[PDB]
Design goal:
Two copies of one chain form a homodimer.
Chain A lengths: L1 E5 L4 E6 L2 E4 L4 E4 L3 H18 L6 E4 L4 E5 L2 E2 L2 E8 L15 E11 L8 E2 L1 H6 L4 H23 L3 E8 L1 E3 L5 E3 L8 E5 L9 H4 L5 H13 L6
Antiparallel strand pairs in A: 1-2, 2-6, 3-4, 5-6, 7-12, 8-9, 8-11, 9-10, 11-14, 12-13
The complex binds adenosine-5'-diphosphate and adenosine monophosphate.
């Protein structure tokens, strides 16, 4: 759903596509405007985080669905932060869907399609070449990011249920937030209704995807999406 | 503005008055219903915090403006947590009123009327007989309380600008949140207008006090006082 095009050694173009993919590509569709919405939401979120002093790969915009980002030495991780019990966490704790967690949970996943992104702990992370110090920093950033995104979205009647983050190392060796932040990579629920406003709408055919993603955009910006 | 009446060695009654006092009692008034509103908002906030596992001195209600609280060995501190630049923080950092801080700031004040509650640091606190361990616990609780209060109020279009907390030691030696939590001891701003919904309205004659405190209450409860 994204294309990474290298500009040079320092920079690349992240292009968001209108393709939607779930269940290892066994379920696929295209939603006109999805790429635009995801790019624009990523811009909003990355700028918000940078305002709080979070280091992100975001450099600038190069068209409706194209971000310019700094090239990173990526950690082989998908880092998940969870505020509310949903999806696979039901398989892990004896708690019902929608349960509000007393504190956020950080889960580490080894980014590997072949192994279907298995959950790992700090010991596995060391084997993958990631020091305890780096992990500690990664989780600390992830929790900060969580608190900012959660609070921002709560004021707009959106529950940040959970979300996935990726990180890499820049030239200086600092840990930098990467990839995207969009309804493809977060679970958003409406505060009142608890309806999904995210990719789960596509995964489980619970409604209209473009409609859900526009809802998010409109609530954040106050403007209906055009282009 | 409060009267503490001992029940026994374990408990006391915190009675909220209608008296308002600012600038070392050089500015004083009375607002009918103020005590009731402060008592009730304190109840709401203490219960909200206990729901999250914060240990507080709150035991129960004994009338509209009376709380039953557990008696504590008090730390000689006023602990201030700040999310948004206001008041005296403008005197300390090169930042404008209303500036949103990247992270909350915790300030320690030695509770002493004579010295006009001076700011202190961890070294001063040790002199006052407070260990670095206790200070760390206090600030950790204070930051926890901050996050819960701030998030709760934000959902209701209220900015928790800053607020003052006090702590004491119970019989077990645990650190327990005490005093009150109300528009007397917090800075609340309306999210949209940025108007004060707290004691600042009385301090600087920026509007109707009872009106501002009722606003807070109504937004929280959904009911008019
Ligand atoms: N649980 C408690 N146990 C003992 N003392 C307390 C407790 N809660 C509050 N206090 C103290 O009781 C006093 C009541 O507040 P107030 O009358 O406004 O006093 P002041 O204006 O002198 O700070 C405060 O000095 C506060 O430190
Ligand atoms: N700033 C960055 N530098 C290098 N790689 C990145 C950056 N941001 C994201 N990536 C990776 O680029 C790929 C684009 O994601 P996708 O094509 O959706 O799998 C993913 O493998 C990301 O981990």
């Amino acid at each position: 759903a994204k294309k990474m095009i290298p500009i040079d050694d320092d920079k690349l173009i992240m292009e968001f596509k209108d393709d939607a993919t779930a269940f290892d590509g066994t379920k696929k569709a295209r939603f006109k405007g999805k790429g635009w919405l995801n790019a624009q939401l990523s811009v909003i979120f990355f700028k918000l985080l940078e305002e709080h002093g979070i280091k992100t790969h975001f450099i600038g915009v190069a068209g409706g669905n194209r971000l310019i980002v700094e090239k990173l030495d990526m950690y082989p991780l998908e880092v998940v932060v969870r505020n509310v019990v949903a999806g696979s966490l039901k398989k892990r704790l004896p708690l019902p869907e929608g349960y509000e967690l007393p504190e956020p949970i950080v889960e580490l996943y080894y980014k590997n399609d072949e192994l279907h992104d298995p959950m790992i702990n700090y010991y596995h992370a060391k084997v993958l070449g990631i020091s305890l110090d780096e992990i500690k920093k990664i989780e600390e950033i992830a929790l900060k990011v969580n608190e900012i995104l959660k609070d921002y979205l709560a004021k707009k009647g959106i529950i940040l249920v959970d979300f996935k983050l990726e990180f890499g190392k820049d030239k200086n060796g600092d840990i930098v937030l990467a990839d995207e932040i969009s309804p493809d990579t977060c679970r958003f629920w409406d505060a009142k209704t608890k309806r999904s406003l995210d990719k789960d709408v596509f995964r489980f055919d619970k409604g209209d995807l473009i409609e859900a993603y526009k809802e998010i955009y409109e609530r954040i910006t106050g403007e209906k999406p055009e282009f």
